[PDB]
Amino acid sequence: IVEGSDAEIGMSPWQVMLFRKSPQELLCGASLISDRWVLTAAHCLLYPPWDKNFTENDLLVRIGKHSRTRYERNIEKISMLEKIYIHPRYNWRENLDRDIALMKLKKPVAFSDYIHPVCLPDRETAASLLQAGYKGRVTGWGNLKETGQPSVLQVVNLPIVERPVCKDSTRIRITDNMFCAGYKPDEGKRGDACEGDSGGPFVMKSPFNNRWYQMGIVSWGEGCDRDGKYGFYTHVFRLKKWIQKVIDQFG
């Protein structure tokens, strides 16, 4: 996260770290959506241009974390993966359309002060909150700059951007399964996701029921925190029918 700040303790208790076993390193962010299911970006697991194709046994999920590198004894919980599910129409060839994946844990994780699931939006909450100017919050342990790495989880709040501005900022083909967020050059403030933040959540706190909803997944961007560029996020609600299909079939 570029131009963010240190998270407060328990600020993002749905935050998940995807952790590579060997070599032991941060792979991606992710989010906890129930005691047995974790949501992330497909490109965190499958991206053939970079020879990335992880299997369940390659990875661990670390939940309840704050420090990036520490083993947070008596706080974090480490889970093994039972199964990975990637969206069947994930477009790794072109533009990361439908950049979404689910991971089922081998065993349920115990909730605590530091571990708690985020809500997924309904049609109404998405329609109400996914509006240009409305801010969400992005969290992760990714790079602090485009070209180092944080001690603890970082957070930044960013406004959703009008679709034509998103489209005009890039040569990549944008789809309805994406939205973009970030400040404009004239808006002064800044901030962005960066490499390592992939798969983490873009969340909004509903002013109607005071619950946090995951509206987006950190997907892609051209550089980090560049003027006139914006971060792109998987549109969770647009892909919710797939999420529900997978959980209903395999849950």
Partner: peptide, 28 residues
């Protein structure tokens, strides 16, 4: 889950985090 999106150290104890107000102010 019925309890999703309510943080033990914040909403569950009626404490606010340092920047959630910025989000609320944007929801015009």
């Amino acid at each position: 889950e019925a309890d999703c999106g309510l943080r033990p150290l914040f909403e569950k104890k009626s404490l606010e985090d340092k920047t959630e107000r910025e989000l609320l102010e944007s929801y015009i």
